[PDB]
Amino acid sequence: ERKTLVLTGASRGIGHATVKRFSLAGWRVITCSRQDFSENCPWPAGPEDHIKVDLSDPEDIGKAIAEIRRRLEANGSKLHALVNNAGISPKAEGGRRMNSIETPMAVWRDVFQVNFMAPIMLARGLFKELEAAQGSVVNVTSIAGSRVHPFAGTAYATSKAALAALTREMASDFGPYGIRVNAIAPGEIDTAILGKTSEVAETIYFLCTETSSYVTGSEIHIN
Numbered sequence: 763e764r765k766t767l768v769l770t771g772a773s774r775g776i777g778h779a780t781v782k783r784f785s786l787a788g789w790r791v792i793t794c795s796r797q798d799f800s801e802n803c804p805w806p807a808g809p810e811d812h813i814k815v816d817l818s819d820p821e822d823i824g825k826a827i828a829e830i831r832r833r834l835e836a837n838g839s840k841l842h843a844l845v846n847n848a849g850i851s852p853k854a855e856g857g858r859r860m861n862s863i864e865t866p867m868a869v870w871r872d873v874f875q876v877n878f879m880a881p882i883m884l885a886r887g888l889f890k891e892l893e894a895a896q897g898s899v900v901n902v903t904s905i906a907g908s909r910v911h912p913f914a915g916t917a918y919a920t921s922k923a924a925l926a927a928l929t930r931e932m933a934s935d936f937g938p939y940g941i942r943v944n945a946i947a948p949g950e951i952d953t954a955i956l957g958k959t960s961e962v963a964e965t966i967y968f969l970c971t972e973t974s975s976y977v978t979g980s981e982i983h984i985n
């Protein structure tokens with residue numbers, strides 16, 4: 763019965779505020795993280811709501827998808843929401859911003875894999891359950907996708923710009939199956955890559971509930 767959310771990037775700020783919003787609304791919240799489940803976690807969700815997965819690893823993502831699908835059988839194999847908030851912006855030597863000149867191949871690869879490929883891999887991997895629920899996919903974009911930012915490196919900026927375009931394409935592709943796909947760009951950089959965050963969490967929640975049933979292919983720019 764209970765509506766279910768799969769969330770990546772459940773970090774302090776936007777991620778935690780989103781967990782809190784959906785938890786208080788009565789949803790089951792399955793969080794994905796590189797870390798082992800710990801009883802010192804802020805929310806009281808048990809191990810059945812935690813998925814250990816490294817989103818830079820396509821093999822691990824396939825293993826996480828299969829485990830999520832098994833855990834969704836407890837609700838009729840429905841996934842009402844997938845929220846892609848995981849994002850990385852690796853820094854150069856000495857904690858410096860990493861620009862287009864200095865970014866090595868391995869960073870381009872891992873940043874695009876986590877920030878860009880994992881959202882579509884998870885959405886198409888969980889397609890059956892999203893379709894069964896006529897669910898919602900939210901991709902969290904960034905102001906860095908549209909303007910050069912002092913606190914976000916080039917790989918992050920370009921992968922988030924790619925993610926904004928991917929959101930538009932996914933909405934067109936997933937639409938005929940009844941799955942809506944939208945993006946939200948917070949007004950400030952997500953401090954995870956280092957009141958306003960509650961607004962982002964509220965908007966993600968809106969995009970996953972009945973009032974947004976007819977909205978797809980949009981990108982909401984929080985001002």
Ligand SMILES: [Ca+2]
Binds near residue numbers: 893894
């Ligand atoms: Ca169907």
